[PDB]
Amino acid sequence: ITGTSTVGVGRGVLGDQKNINTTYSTYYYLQDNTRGDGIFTYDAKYRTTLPGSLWADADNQFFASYDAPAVDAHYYAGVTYDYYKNVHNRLSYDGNNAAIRSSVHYSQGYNNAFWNGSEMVYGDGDGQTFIPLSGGIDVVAHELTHAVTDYTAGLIYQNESGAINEAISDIFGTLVEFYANKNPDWEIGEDVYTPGISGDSLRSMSDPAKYGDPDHYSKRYTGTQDNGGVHINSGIINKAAYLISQGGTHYGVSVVGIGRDKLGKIFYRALTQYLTPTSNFSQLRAAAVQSATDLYGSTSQEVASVKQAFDAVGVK
Ligand SMILES: [Ca+2]
Ligand SMILES: [Ca+2]
Ligand SMILES: [Ca+2]
Ligand SMILES: [Ca+2]
Ligand SMILES: [Zn+2]
Numbered sequence: 001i002t003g004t005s006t007v008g009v010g011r012g013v014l015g016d017q018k019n020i021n022t023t024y025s026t027y028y029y030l031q032d033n034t035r036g037d038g039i040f041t042y043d044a045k046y047r048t049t050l051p052g053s054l055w056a057d058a059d060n061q062f063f064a065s066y067d068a069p070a071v072d073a074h075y076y077a078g079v080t081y082d083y084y085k086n087v088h089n090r091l092s093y094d095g096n097n098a099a100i101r102s103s104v105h106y107s108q109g110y111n112n113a114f115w116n117g118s119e120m121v122y123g124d125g126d127g128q129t130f131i132p133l134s135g136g137i138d139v140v141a142h143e144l145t146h147a148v149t150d151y152t153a154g155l156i157y158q159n160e161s162g163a164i165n166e167a168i169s170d171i172f173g174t175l176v177e178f179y180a181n182k183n184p185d186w187e188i189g190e191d192v193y194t195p196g197i198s199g200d201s202l203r204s205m206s207d208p209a210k211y212g213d214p215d216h217y218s219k220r221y222t223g224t225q226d227n228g229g230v231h232i233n234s235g236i237i238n239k240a241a242y243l244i245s246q247g248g249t250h251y252g253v254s255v256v257g258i259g260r261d262k263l264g265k266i267f268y269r270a271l272t273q274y275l276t277p278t279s280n281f282s283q284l285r286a287a288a289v290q291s292a293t294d295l296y297g298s299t300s301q302e303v304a305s306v307k308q309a310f311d312a313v314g315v316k
Helices: 065-088 137-151 159-180 225-229 234-246 260-274 281-296 301-312
Strands: 004-011 017-025 027-029 039-043 100-104 113-115 120-122 248-250 253-255
Touching: 004 065, 017 065, 039 065, 065 100, 065 120, 065 137, 065 159, 065 260, 113 137, 120 137, 137 159, 159 225, 159 234, 159 260, 159 281, 234 248, 234 260, 234 281, 234 301, 253 301, 260 281, 260 301, 281 301
Parallel strands: 039 100, 100 120
Antiparallel strands: 004 017, 017 027, 113 120, 248 253
């Protein structure tokens, strides 16, 4: 829409109040013109036709409970855009300031969210397994990192490349959650998963086995379900990334942590310069070693930590 940029206020899914960038032209729309070619949030109105209607609002105050998922999707896409711009000097997901589009209220009782190749889509959850999925900043950043991958390495979504694809999204979703300093942790989806239970989450990067996911290459899933285990075998890579960052001893192998910032620089470089559509775990290890080598020298501690971490999860 063509209009005047302004700022509205509303409440997100967890009840927190925030300012959001809107556009005024008869109605106030969820269109943020301050970032690249714009961030646009749509109402799918409980249907599965996409994108639905650009979200329109009469007075620029988004406190209705129907508005909550739209507020957070809108807001957390802006935070993710800022993270990639400020930290990695990347303008939007294609590197050219492509418009970011999200639809909320997709379908009825839908317990998921996803990047479909052209935009983000968020279900509201059934209210028991999940509440509206855009309330989780690590979920929004996970899904938006899928767009980044698609334009760079292009990892195919099955078997080991798909598991790498998923782990990359859990890693940057987590790094965006630490960047926004929203109660950060190494768990995925804990703000929106099972509103009745405290403490749990969909997956854990610091201890994947807590939920039954593999934390070592000898425990990888080899069947056919979940596209060859793309959400399951990503635990091996997540555990490796957690160790590079934080350090620790795993199956008897000791890793000195080098921190989150270097973790993000190494994986972002590996992703945009060395991974290809069919890379598998052993090529990820080589990409990450080469990236850390490029940035810190082949005899740095950084290179040494990336090798110990992949040795600790059994990836050679
Ligand atoms: Ca309103
Ligand atoms: Ca958290
Ligand atoms: Ca989290
Ligand atoms: Ca829970
Ligand atoms: Zn994913």
